[PDB]
Every structure is written in structure tokens, then in C-alpha cells.
Amino acid sequence: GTSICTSEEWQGLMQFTLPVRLCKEIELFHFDIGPFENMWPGIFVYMVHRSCGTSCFELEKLCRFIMSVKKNYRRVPYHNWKHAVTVAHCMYAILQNNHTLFTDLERKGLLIACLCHDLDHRGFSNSYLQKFDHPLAALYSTSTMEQHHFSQTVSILQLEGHNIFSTLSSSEYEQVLEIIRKAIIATDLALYFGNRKQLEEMYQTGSLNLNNQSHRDRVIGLMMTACDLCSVTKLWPVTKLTANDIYAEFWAEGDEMKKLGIQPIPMMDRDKKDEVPQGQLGFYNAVAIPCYTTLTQILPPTEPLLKACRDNLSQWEKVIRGEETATW
Numbered sequence: 001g002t003s004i005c006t007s008e009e010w011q012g013l014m015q016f017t018l019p020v021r022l023c024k025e026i027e028l029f030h031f032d033i034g035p036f037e038n039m040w041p042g043i044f045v046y047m048v049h050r051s052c053g054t055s056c057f058e059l060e061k062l063c064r065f066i067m068s069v070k071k072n073y074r075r076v077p078y079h080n081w082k083h084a085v086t087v088a089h090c091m092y093a094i095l096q097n098n099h100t101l102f103t104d105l106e107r108k109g110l111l112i113a114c115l116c117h118d119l120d121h122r123g124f125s126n127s128y129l130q131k132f133d134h135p136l137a138a139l140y141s142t143s144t145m146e147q148h149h150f151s152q153t154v155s156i157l158q159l160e161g162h163n164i165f166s167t168l169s170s171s172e173y174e175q176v177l178e179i180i181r182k183a184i185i186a187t188d189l190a191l192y193f194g195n196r197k198q199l200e201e202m203y204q205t206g207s208l209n210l211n212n213q214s215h216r217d218r219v220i221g222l223m224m225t226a227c228d229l230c231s232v233t234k235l236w237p238v239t240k241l242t243a244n245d246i247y248a249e250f251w252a253e254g255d256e257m258k259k260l261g262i263q264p265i266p267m268m269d270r271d272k273k274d275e276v277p278q279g280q281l282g283f284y285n286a287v288a289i290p291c292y293t294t295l296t297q298i299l300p301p302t303e304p305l306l307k308a309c310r311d312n313l314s315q316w317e318k319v320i321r322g323e324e325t326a327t328w
């Protein structure tokens with residue numbers, strides 16, 4: 001089912017104003033929402049306003065939406081409200097450096113998609129649900145969770161006075177849902193591998209063209225992935241801390257696989273922490289680097305995200321060689 005924010009919750013956010021000093025920081029790729037928990041909702045409003053305009057959605061309908069989107073996230077270590085807003089910010093940063101490539105309808109859809117992309121997450125992966133045949137795996141055969149995430153989004157839209165997209169033409173309403181659906185589905189990392197490879201080939205052969213709708217969906221696809229993984233693009237100490245959350249969640253799933261007579265993969269096994277560095281190294285070379293490498297080629301203003309990822313790759317190599325500092 002679906003939860004609704006209180007009258008007290010959405011009204012408090014409307015009064016919200018972003019401290020002056022933050023306006024300058026929020027624009028940067030490396031900005032870290034972490035030290036500002038109370039502000040997160042109003043941080044998103046700010047990004048929506050700056051990107052899509054103040055007269056984009058009715059403020060009340062938007063604020064009701066956001067605080068209900070907050071409440072429908074779970075107290076899991078990683079795939080939580082904190083993550084949703086961190087992905088939204090990275091998208092906002094990309095959009096601001098690439099504003100005129102994307103239409104007004106796309107930007108609003110992509111920002112909403114990022115905030116909604118992990119809705120009602122349980123801390124269990126696609127592997128888990130399909131290995132053990134959860135009812136979600138039978139209803140959604142591929143990209144299982146990502147389909148539930150979008151289904152959750154639509155359910156929140158259908159709440160009393162929550163529909164932010166109502167003041168669009170019925171044709172544009174169809175379009176923005178499809179943009180959102182295609183964005184949320186693209187966060188399934190299984191799909192990423194094929195997407196990047198294809199996008200790379202289209203760029204090298206020069207056939208890439210943003211006026212071709214199928215190309216746009218793919219670039220949007222890579223952008224979604226870039227935002228999903230942006231923890232690997234923050235400053236090393238922030239990157240290190242977030243990893244602890246990702247693994248805290250991985251390990252609790254491993255704790256379930258054991259009882260049902262399965263040795264879970266090394267990455268999810270809490271008695272196998274020693275492999276974590278080399279696992280990150282592998283994940284950067286196989287997924288992260290190539291994702292930010294390709295995105296930069298397509299959108300050169302996004303280059304700082306790749307610089308920061310190369311930076312964190314280097315720090316994981318340092319941890320492997322035993323050169324690790326304290327960092328808490």
C-alpha cells in the first residue's frame with residue numbers, strides 16, 4: 001500500500017527557504033546533501049524551481065507529492081530518502097550544465113523520476129527476489145524492482161491533490177509518464193551494460209544524434225545511471241562513508257540467503273569484508289569509469305563527474321596496497 005504525508009508535513013515545507021550560502025554550492029557536481037538532513041525536501045523544491053520554474057507545478061500539489069514521496073521510502077541502510085535526493089541533485093547538476101539540450105517536459109520528468117526511482121525499496125536485490133520467487137518476480141519478470149518503483153510513483157500521483165502533472169495536456173501527460181518510466185527502468189544496472197556499449201558505438205561512428213528519439217532515451221538512460229552511482233563522484237571521505245551504507249544493506253540480504261541454504265555471493269557476505277576493496281576496484285573498472293567516460297564524451301560539461309570517479313578509483317587502489325588513512 002501507499003502512505004500519505006500529514007497536513008503538518010507538507011505545510012512546513014512550503015514555508016521553507018534555502019540559506020543563501022547553499023545556493024552557490026548546490027550548483028556544483030560534488031555537492032554533498034549529507035550535512036543538511038532537515039533541508040532535503042526544500043532542497044528539492046529549490047532545484048525544481050530553478051530548473052523548471054516556480055509556475056511549473058502548483059506549490060501545494062508539489063509539496064504534498066514530495067513529502068509523500070519521502071514517507072514511502074524505507075529505513076533501509078542505503079536505498080533510502082537520502083539516496084533519492086542525492087540522485088535528484090546529480091540530475092539537477094547535469095541538467096543545469098546541459099539545460100537547452102532537454103525540453104521543459106523532460107527536465108521536470110527526470111527530476112521527479114530521480115526522486116522516485118527507488119520508491120518502496122526493501123533492501124533486497126533483483127537477484128534475491130528472482131532466486132527465491134517473491135510474488136514481485138512473477139508479476140515483474142525483468143527489471144523487477146525498477147518496475148515496482150514506477151508503479152509506486154504512479155500510485156502517489158493518483159493520491160488526492162498529489163497529481164503535479166495534471167496541468168499538462170493529456171498528450172504531454174502521456175509523454176512525461178513515459179519519460180519517467182523509461183528513466184526509472186534504466187536504473188536497472190543489467191540494462192546499463194548494453195546501453196553504454198551501444199552509446200559508445202554510436203558516438204565513435206558519429207551516428208549519434210539527439211534529434212533521434214531512440215538516441216535521446218539512451219542518453220537519458222546513461223544520465224540516470226550516472227546519477228544513481230554518483231556516490232562514487234563525491235569527495236573521498238563522503239564516498240567511503242556511503243560505501244558503508246551500500247554494504248550494510250548487501251550484508252543483511254546475505255544474512256537471509258544463508259538460512260535458506262545458500263552461500264551468498266562474496267559481495268553480500270558479512271564474513272568476507274576483506275574482499276570489499278578489490279570488489280570496488282572491479283566495480284569502478286567494469287561499470288563506473290566507463291559510465292562517466294561515455295557520458296563526458298556525450299556531454300562534455302559533465303567532465304567533473306569523471307575526474308572525481310578517477311580520483312576515488314585511485315583511493316581504492318591505495319586501500320588495496322595498504323596505504324589507508326583513518327577517515328572514520
Ligand SMILES: Nc1nc2c(Cl)cccc2s1
Pocket residue numbers: 229231232243246267279280283
Ligand atoms: N559504489 C557502489 N558499488 C556498487 C556495487 Cl559493488 C554493486 C552495485 C551498485 C553499486 S554502487
Ligand code: NI
Pocket residue numbers: 117118145146187188
Ligand atoms: Ni533502484
Ligand code: NI
Pocket residue numbers: 083087117118187228
Ligand atoms: Ni538508486
